[PDB]
Design an enzyme around this catalytic site. Structure first.
Site, PDB file in Angstrom:
ATOM      1  N   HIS A 101       1.009  -1.324  -0.303  1.00 52.69           N
ATOM      2  CA  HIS A 101      -0.086  -0.079   0.265  1.00 52.69           C
ATOM      3  C   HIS A 101       1.036   1.529  -0.103  1.00 52.69           C
ATOM      4  O   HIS A 101       2.232   1.352   0.136  1.00 52.69           O
ATOM      5  CB  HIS A 101      -0.541  -0.349   1.283  1.00 52.69           C
ATOM      6  CG  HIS A 101       0.069   0.237   2.706  1.00 52.69           C
ATOM      7  ND1 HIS A 101       0.250   1.188   2.689  1.00 52.69           N
ATOM      8  CD2 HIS A 101       0.542  -0.608   3.759  1.00 52.69           C
ATOM      9  CE1 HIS A 101       1.944   0.890   4.519  1.00 52.69           C
ATOM     10  NE2 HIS A 101       1.369  -0.373   4.620  1.00 52.69           N
ATOM     11  N   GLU A 151      -0.454  -6.416   7.980  1.00 54.01           N
ATOM     12  CA  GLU A 151       1.506  -6.977   8.286  1.00 54.01           C
ATOM     13  C   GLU A 151       1.983  -7.210  10.350  1.00 54.01           C
ATOM     14  O   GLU A 151       0.192  -7.696  10.516  1.00 54.01           O
ATOM     15  CB  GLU A 151       2.094  -4.952   8.569  1.00 54.01           C
ATOM     16  CG  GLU A 151       2.993  -5.487   9.118  1.00 54.01           C
ATOM     17  CD  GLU A 151       4.081  -5.477   7.961  1.00 54.01           C
ATOM     18  OE1 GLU A 151       3.880  -4.950   6.959  1.00 54.01           O
ATOM     19  OE2 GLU A 151       4.297  -6.292   8.072  1.00 54.01           O
TER      20      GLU A 151
END
Length: 177
Positions: free
Chosen positions: A8, A74
């Site tokens: 991202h 993450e």
């Protein structure tokens, strides 16, 4: 199998060098621009995304309507969330550089992290675009024998589980001297 892995766009912390895991930080303005540049560029394959804001927003700006999966998040840094790389305990700094044998105090171990990531990939039955995070992309690339160091807003296509096929916006920021 063809899988696209998208890191991202940039967040304030990605820019400052602070560890970012489950802290739900938003994309910076430039981070949104990086995501918009992906629209029309990536293949129109089924999209799956981390449920964290920055990942979802990247997917949206890239022109997709992904289903949200926590398995694509993450790693959870725990007490290290927001910690500056500068003053990080050398033990953790070295662990992250080698990307091995590392359990962020209060967070997820690297082994549990990679297990959910790879397990998720094995559930894929057809080519797809995954909007996720730097650690996820690095884990996948390292398993393929590559360093897995990609910049925010970049996309990499791999023939899982064999090799890299394509690198998008992989080159870094241009340098002047």
């Amino acid at each position: 199998m063809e899988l696209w892995l998208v890191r991202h766009g940039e967040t304030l912390w990605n820019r400052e060098g602070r560890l970012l895991g489950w802290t739900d930080l938003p994309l910076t303005a430039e981070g949104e621009a990086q995501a918009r540049r992906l629209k029309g560029a990536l293949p129109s394959l089924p999209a799956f995304s981390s449920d964290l804001l920055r990942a979802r927003r990247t997917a949206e700006l890239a022109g997709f309507s992904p289903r949200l999966y926590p398995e694509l998040r993450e790693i959870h840094f725990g007490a290290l969330e927001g910690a500056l790389w500068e003053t990080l305990d050398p033990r953790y700094k070295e662990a992250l550089l080698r990307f091995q044998g590392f359990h962020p105090p209060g967070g997820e171990s690297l082994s549990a992290f990679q297990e959910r990531v790879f397990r998720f990939l094995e559930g894929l039955k057809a080519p797809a675009v995954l909007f996720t995070h730097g650690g996820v992309v690095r884990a996948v690339l390292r398993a393929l024998g590559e360093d897995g160091l990609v910049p925010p807003g970049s996309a990499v296509a791999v023939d899982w589980p064999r090799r890299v096929l394509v690198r998008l916006a992989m080159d870094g920021e241009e340098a002047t001297g």
